[PDB]
With several copies, the nearest count.
Chain A
């Protein structure tokens, strides 16, 4: 058995020891047994078969990534969303559009929104410093 890490830019998706894996490499399906010679390749979006030590199979869905096989370790640098050129270009076009037309979205923090509104209303017309003769 060998140690395997499946990690995204955001979170660790898997860890531990494994017996083997099967991956749909970019240039064709592929299977990594222990001692496999060092290898580096991209992988297509789809399931990656694991069989954990003692034969426990499971499937993890990967949206794509890069697979790096080292002398004794293997790590899959999965990513969070489908990547290509047709997509990333649309993302960049919208990122420019939102900058040209000054489009600003709200955050989603309802807690800070309510607290800030209560804090602004409580401090209004307070006039305390005119009243306690704090020189300032």
Chain B
């Protein structure tokens, strides 16, 4: 309701929920206290309505909008459990963070292969952005198994048709890093805000073989691509 008050002023607001799963479990506890009969896997009989009456208030209105970023915990790692299953009926996007991508020193540690959004359609986001995202997705999910070969048989086993895929995938993988205005306290480097246009340009470039002439660390933590060329200049 505080976010709704801000929406009524005509602003665009962002609402974070620290764990929606605990919002479900608090309702289960209260329902048990009130003595109502249990339901699907022990949950309250009104699970989907308690979830909907919340998730249905955060929408874009003719005056303003509330966007929401909600941390979700899946019980027993089961995406079929009634609580995850009910929550996913409402989510639009889905970003998966991975310990691995962080271990490799890339931040933000988003996983590009499991992160998904149902806004990725030519009919909504455009054809160029759609096929660019699909490009980088296919490049990385091939690299994911070329790097499986390399582990067992060594690098020089690869065809040179593949030693190019590896060298482009590594650069794409680096270019997904970014410096935050909030991370300066760690990285020192100034934070950068990258418009969408810039990202579509940069990834079209890297994928279609342009910028092959400069090394991969010219992309790491850089920002736009027009900055990757400079970091390659002073490298």
Contact = CB atoms under 8 A, between A and B. Distances in A.
Nearest to A116: B152
Interface in A92-136: 106-108, 110, 113-114, 116-118, 121, 123, 126-130, 134, 136
Contacts of B152: 106, 113-114, 116-117, 123
Contacts, number: 42
B148 A129 contact: yes
A134 B147 CA distance: 10
B154 A123 contact: no
A94 B165 CA distance: 33
B37 interface: no
The secondary structure that dominates the A interface is helix
Interface string A73-107: 00000000000000000000000000000000011
Interface size class of B (residues with CB under 8 A): 10 to 19
Contacts of A136: 147, 150-151
Contact of B151 (A107, A108, A110, A129): A129
Contacts of B150: 136
B147 A110 contact: no
A106 B147 contact: no
B153 A106 contact: yes
Contacts of A114: 148-149, 152
Point out which of B148, B149, B153 has the most chain A C-beta atoms below 10 A from its C-beta. B148
B148 A110 contact: no
A113 B150 CA distance: 9
A94 B213 CA distance: 35
B39 interface: no
B148 A117 contact: yes
B148 A113 contact: yes
Nearest to A110: B149
B149 A123 contact: yes
B29 interface: no
A128 B147 CA distance: 9
Nearest to A132: B151
B153 A113 contact: yes
B144 interface: yes
Contacts of A113: 148-149, 152-153
Nearest to B154: A106
Interface in B108-159: 144, 147-154, 157
Interface of B: 144, 147-154, 157
Given A106-B157, A113-B153, A121-B148, 11 more contacts: A106-B153, A106-B154, A108-B153, A113-B148, A117-B148, A126-B148, A127-B148, A129-B151, A134-B151, A136-B150, A136-B151
